[PDB]
Amino acid sequence: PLTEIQVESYKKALQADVPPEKRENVGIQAAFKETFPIEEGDKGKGGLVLDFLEYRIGDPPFSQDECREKDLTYQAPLYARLQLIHKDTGLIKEDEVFLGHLPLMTEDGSFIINGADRVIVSQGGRTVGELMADQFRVGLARLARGVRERMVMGSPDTLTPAKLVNSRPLEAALREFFSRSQLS
Amino acid sequence: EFRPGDKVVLPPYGVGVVAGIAQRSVSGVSRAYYQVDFPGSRSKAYVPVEAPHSVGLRKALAPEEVPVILDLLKNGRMPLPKQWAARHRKTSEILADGNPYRIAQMAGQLRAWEVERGLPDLDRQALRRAIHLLAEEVAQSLEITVQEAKRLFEEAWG
């Protein structure tokens, strides 16, 4: 079925059950690894590196029901394990940080956006995951070229992955992607 | 120099505990690190063994370094810059370096002002942040809660 590939498109796009090390360079993992690492500075000055280890997805605040009986979304928070390394001193600081909330499919094949049981569609051969997985790549693009802008206002000893990162650019990237979608 | 289970401090994330010695290859160069785990945090730090003081790592206060800290909060005085810009710079440094003794002595001075002459909010935030940090390292050292470590401080002032 059309809806079968899609609930699978999305399925492996996420690898949300795969042990990160057993996760493959596909979709989200691809997006992450394409984006990361981010180097900046001349190595000597504030020579920096922000690198990706893995992402985790923390299960949704509510099951289908509650996201439904409320003008909100069936979402899971997504966090990623990052390391900041000073090329100067060799110190690594590893935080898990929150990047964005992330919408989930039903076995039916739909999302509960702001309560609305909306629907995205397979275009130009691209499937659900793919079309989305590239939107992921977008936010991350925007987020890099952030992180690396912060990288050059100094504060080396003060800096942390946490401080290089916020949730806005990825929030936006999926905000827009899902404001362009059908209503079942 | 440092051993697993050692309670430690690493500016800026503060107190932690040496997990063990980690071997990471990072950017094509494999090296040994001390691994530091942070409080209910999921955040870690990896410090090269070759020189860890060099990079800010230190032991935390022993339970017997603690009463001297409490005396600093109670009776501590230090000279501070005339002008607010330079003063905030000094305090900003003291807070960053993470020297508990220097921080306690600063905090003692700042609190003193808060009483006699009055403390600017800007400087007040330096005091709070100082308290915050000291309460966590004292809580760690005596294995009491942070709320409990603060309450200690509160009494040291009256």
Author numbering:
A (entry chain A): 17 to 139, 332 to 392
B (entry chain B): 3 to 160
What does the paper say about this structure?
CarD, first identified as a regulator of ribosomal RNA (rRNA) transcription in Mycobacterium tuberculosis (Mtb), is a transcriptional activator widely distributed among bacterial species, including Thermus species, but is absent in Eco. Crystal structures of Tth and Mtb CarD reveal an N-terminal domain with a Tudor-like fold (CarD-RID, RNAP interacting domain) in common with the Eco transcription repair coupling factor (TRCF)-RID, and a helical C-terminal domain (CarD-CTD). The structural results, combined with supporting biochemical studies, establish that the CarD-RID makes a protein/protein interaction with the RNAP β1-lobe, thereby positioning the CarD-CTD and a conserved Trp residue to interact with the upstream edge of the transcription bubble, using a wedge mechanism to prevent collapse of the transcription bubble.
Docking CarD onto the RNAP was facilitated by a high-resolution crystal structure of a Tth CarD/Taq β1-lobe complex (2.4 Å-resolution). A crystal structure of Mtb CarD in complex with an Mtb RNAP β-subunit fragment that includes the β1-lobe shows a relative orientation of the CarD-RID/CarD-CTD domains very different from the one in our Tth CarD structures, despite high sequence and structural similarity within the domains.
